[PDB]
Amino acid sequence: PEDAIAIVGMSGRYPGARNVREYWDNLVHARNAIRDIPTSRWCKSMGMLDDIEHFDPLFFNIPPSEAELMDPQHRIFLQEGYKAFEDAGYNARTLNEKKCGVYLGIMSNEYGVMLNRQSTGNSFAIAAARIPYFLNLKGPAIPIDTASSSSLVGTHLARQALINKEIDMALVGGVSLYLTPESYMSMCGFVPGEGAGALVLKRLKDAEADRDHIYGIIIGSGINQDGKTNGITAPSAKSQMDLERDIYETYGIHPESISYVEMHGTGTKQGDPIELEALSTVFQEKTDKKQFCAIGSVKSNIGHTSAAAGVAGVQKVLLCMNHKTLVPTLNFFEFEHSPLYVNTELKPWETADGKPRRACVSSFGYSGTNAHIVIEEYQPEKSALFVLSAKKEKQLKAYAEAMKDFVTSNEDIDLEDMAYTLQTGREAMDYRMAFLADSREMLIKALDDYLAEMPNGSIFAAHVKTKKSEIKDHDAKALLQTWIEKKRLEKVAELWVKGLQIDWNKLYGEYTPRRISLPAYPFAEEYYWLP
Amino acid sequence: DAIAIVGMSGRYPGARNVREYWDNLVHARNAIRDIPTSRWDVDKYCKSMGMLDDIEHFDPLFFNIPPSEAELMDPQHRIFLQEGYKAFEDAGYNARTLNEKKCGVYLGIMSNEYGVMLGNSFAIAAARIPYFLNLKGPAIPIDTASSSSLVGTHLARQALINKEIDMALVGGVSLYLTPESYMSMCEVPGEGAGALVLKRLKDAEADRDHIYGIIIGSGINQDGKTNGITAPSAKSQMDLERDIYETYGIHPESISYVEMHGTGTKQGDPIELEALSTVFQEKTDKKQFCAIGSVKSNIGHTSAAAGVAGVQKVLLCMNHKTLVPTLNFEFEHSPLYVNTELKPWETADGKPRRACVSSFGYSGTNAHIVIEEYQPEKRNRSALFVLSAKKEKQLKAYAEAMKDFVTSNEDIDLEDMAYTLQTGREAMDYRMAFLADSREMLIKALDDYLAEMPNGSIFAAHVKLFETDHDAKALLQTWIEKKRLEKVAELWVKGLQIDWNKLYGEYTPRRISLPAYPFAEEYYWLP
């Protein structure tokens, strides 16, 4: 049991959703993001990402000329993988030399082909390794290609390595794009889908000790093969049942405790009756209770997203748990006498009696390698100085807008958690701004003044350069401390924007706030494609 | 806990199998050659490679694959199907006994060229064996460039220890089908394909598998930030090695050979030396007690297959208690020496030999494992030899491989051989059987069969009221207990299923390594 794995960070980019918050808002409103394929790229519809050519190579210390040579899958994953770490409240400083493994679901290598007719950089290997190379992580970095089960197979491997104590953190993800018509048509009536997502995992006990924010807990997982089926793309009912049963047995999970399953299938393809029967039979081995478990699939919203399917599904489940809300599955065997029902409504996600909500995700690929994972709701033991920095001023401004939007959408935000998170959970980069605020309304006002260039005496800003501070010595340091303990946050703000390193923990005595989810770095949006 | 290696098969430059491989290493053969035109023209684009031969050859029918589909199959997939399959037979397992096993498959593979030249995903590559044999453990390709097969080994080990699977097939395959992929990798590339079969040690002992050696530790990690992604990290290598020795309680003084990642002559190689040497020195002042080398000096740098090629070299050295040369920093004050000799591999009294293998890749993901010699417990007339193939021509070819093997192996235990042929091979449709009670009679029967000598001593047929009738079954049994092996032979070649265990009373023989299926050498390339 105390082999529980916490999910402490997430980031996701899917058709119709540039981030996890849009994603949620789309699911809540039952939005279908599938569109007709346009000429700009080249059945006839697809869940597509937008602006797949955009990248911020300088952020990652990659020359612009090399960006053109990078598979966009690699680029987009670097970006999302990175943002997941910030979502968790981790930065370059705090990640440097961590034994963080990286497990990257990825199943196509098309861009490299496209280029070699003009001309290695675009291997699966290098894809997995870009993040560790950028952030100096020390856990293994392994791409996983099991077709559509990839990101969920990666999740299982990460879980096992954490439980074994071989790593102390994992980044697991997936990414899929269809850059040629050929790659589309390899999928498929699977409406093929694009996407890219990442999760950050730690052992639960480390997540609690370090005071991470915890979206949920993985309490079981397993993987297996179909073996011999009637054609390699056809599923095995027995293999699915064995998978599910073996996980529930191994980790002592009673099927009655499970109230949602994020299916592999949409309900409407060839293999999908089998998935339904298998799950239902395994549940019925242990209970005569009827229609207590909702099922659905986000593939009805965003298409069948290949290697990223697992991470997209997990993220949906976590978002449902966090809001205690089940959301429709779109356009979906004898349900009446089964444990299952198809949830087509937006409704509260109910629990029995304080018991945490539990859900599964399934992900089964064309090559017959299957994965299934069980997730449990985490049930916690439940003037500020705001700082923002970016590597270019234009990105700093975009940061301040993303923060303003977030505060405006989220009347509930705890201001002290937000500031603490901005202090300790983001890297101080060269273009810097800071301000004081004691209420939500003051906070919005400062951000608005900063954006509108309205003077405001609570706002400070500078570009680091190579500054001339006499403090960095003894008597000056003692004064800084004096300012902290007297809460002269103006003075702290002023110096911090000019480049002075502040030990943020000293701002806090009795009460220490918590890192929470905030929007992550707003990457430049620069175009790079085949030279 | 301990993982047994119970089967292996390998195909490397200059070596069609693991027996030629050994013979090549013992004689210090270098299999690297000039690239010929049949591959491509080097002059239109260095110039040598460790190459496999007949990379186009495949037996699609054996695997229930249409000939036309073979042409569409990447030869990497084809060759691994063959070697992976043979590793199972090397262990003494067949379709019948593998059906529905939770055997996982971990396949190191790093290039997809044939598909471009034109089903051929890494995913499908890993999965062809499970689909053919109906295995139920996960099937996962691994691409960490050159560390791939050794990273796969680590993942298999962990899954076995956790009890998620009960067997693993781990392997690697690399070919250079275009000048482009050769040149890139090159910033001497080697081809190859190999597999190992792994089980928990306790299951291997209970099932009476033959055990080449034991994996006693492994780990994997990442260089992280280096000066360019292809450059190594001295610290990561030391942390890797140290963390493994500490975690699994292995003292460096117990280690007497290390199969290096590098040959000793390339950019990153001074770093590998210094890292390993430093870690060893943290624990001992002993000097020059650990030999080092690399089979890449013999067969080229074999990419994804490097790990399995290295592990196999180590096992073969342990089995023969022999260290072999490596071909072509201040050693004197180090724990290490470069072994350039063919010499006996010594241990201080009793203790099992221990060795490591390292495998680093262009993407910075490193693996290292520690292997220990297996030391079996002491063990406590006519035998019936049976051979079968799916085509008569392969049966004949099988007869010749067995004859060569018996001829080369003057101390084979005949009973173990027959038992292995009985219980450790599938009975296929073209069948032959004979009796023999000595090595020389065994060779003679095989020779007569090949020469189609009217013998009467040899039974053969192409596939039966001993199935239906109660009293007929009883008679068969009566024949067994009276050791009327001629009668058993006769019926078996016609298709009667025999319960081989009944031939054995209180003394049961053991499965050993024998040559594995001789695939039909049929050419398939681009349609």
UniProtKB/Swiss-Prot annotation, chain A:
It comes from the Bacteria. Disulfide bonds: none annotated. Residues 2-377 form the Ketosynthase family 3 (KS3) domain. It is found in: Cytoplasm. The active site is at S148, H264, H304. Involved in some intermediate steps for the synthesis of the antibiotic polyketide bacillaene which is involved in secondary metabolism. This is Polyketide synthase PksL. The gene is pksL. The chain holds residues 2872 to 3462 of 4538 of the full protein.
